[PDB]
Amino acid sequence: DPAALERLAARYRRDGYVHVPGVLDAGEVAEYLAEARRLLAHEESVRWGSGAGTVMDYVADAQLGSDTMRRLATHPRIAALAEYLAGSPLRLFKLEVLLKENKEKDASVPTAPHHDAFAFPFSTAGTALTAWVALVDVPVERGCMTFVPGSHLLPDPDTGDEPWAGAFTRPGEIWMPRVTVPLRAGDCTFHHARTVHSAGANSTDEPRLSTSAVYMDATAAYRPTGIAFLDDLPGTGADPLREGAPLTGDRFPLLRR
Ligand SMILES: COC(=O)[C@@H]1c2cc3c(c(O)c2[C@@H](O[C@H]2C[C@H](O)[C@@H](O)[C@H](C)O2)C[C@]1(C)O)C(=O)c1c(O)cc2c(c1C3=O)O[C@H]1C[C@H](N(C)C)[C@H](O)[C@]2(C)O1
Numbered sequence: 001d002p003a004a005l006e007r008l009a010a011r012y013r014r015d016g017y018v019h020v021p022g023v024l025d026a027g028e029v030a031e032y033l034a035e036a037r038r039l040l041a042h043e044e045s046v047r048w049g050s051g052a053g054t055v056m057d058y059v060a061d062a063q064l065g066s067d068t069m070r071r072l073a074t075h076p077r078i079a080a081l082a083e084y085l086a087g088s089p090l091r092l093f094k095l096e097v098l099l100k101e102n103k104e105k106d107a108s109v110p111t112a113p114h115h116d117a118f119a120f121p122f123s124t125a126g127t128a129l130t131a132w133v134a135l136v137d138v139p140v141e142r143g144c145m146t147f148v149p150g151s152h153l154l155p156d157p158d159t160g161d162e163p164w165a166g167a168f169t170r171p172g173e174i175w176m177p178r179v180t181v182p183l184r185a186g187d188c189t190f191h192h193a194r195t196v197h198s199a200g201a202n203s204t205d206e207p208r209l210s211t212s213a214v215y216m217d218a219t220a221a222y223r224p225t226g227i228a229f230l231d232d233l234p235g236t237g238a239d240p241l242r243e244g245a246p247l248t249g250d251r252f253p254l255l256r257r
């Protein structure tokens, strides 16, 4: 529906995020859920974490190892929505498989508020957009996200040292309302790179399973952040990438054809 799709982009532009129910059908959920699990048991995961505990375990660049995940990253419907909201043609940068759970030593902790934007190592990071797809029910207590509507319109935070930092540092920012967005399996959220957002801890004995896909402007180019683990991109060849190099080909596939 054209008119409906436009109401959606209005919401995205106003708020810097939007919630889309049922972006995947039931079977598609089961398909992608089963594959997420498999990757989390077989592949190597990365602990995003601290002495407080595990923020999450995740599988980096998961679309490279797995055709299945590549299909989800490039799912026709998610892609079409992504391009419409973004306003221009896009490419996939990365897809990650995400896990919040409670282990015996290692309790699950929240995802602190943050600002994804200049932690993306590409020229157009400022206007990037991220799709987050629930593969299981994610009510509040299981660690759904919270977004600050409007926050994508604020000036960026002081370019200090950690490219994700600066959430809740701008004048009047702490007085803005916040929206907590529980999701049903197969639901997704889109959010703008500059939108401030956070997530709860998983305080339930059932794991929180989701994918997060970062889409980027089709003409984007490499822009090191300085943080080595953000800058070092697998499946790009032997030597590292020089600044200003274009991100293209199957490695960073176009969304539309
Ligand atoms: C240098 O900081 C660290 O060693 C930790 C850390 C790490 C991250 C981040 C961190 O905040 C931290 C650090 O942030 C601290 C900040 C404070 O000290 C406190 O809120 C708590 C102790 O967590 C912890 C640690 C050991 O320093 C991020 O915030 C982060 C992020 O916001 C976004 C990403 C981040 C991060 C972080 O990796 O990494 C990748 C993967 C992500 N995926 C899994 C959704 C994202 O796409 C993205 C862009 O890419």
Ligand code: NI
Residues within 6 Å of the ligand: 114, 115, 116, 197
């Ligand atoms: Ni984020």
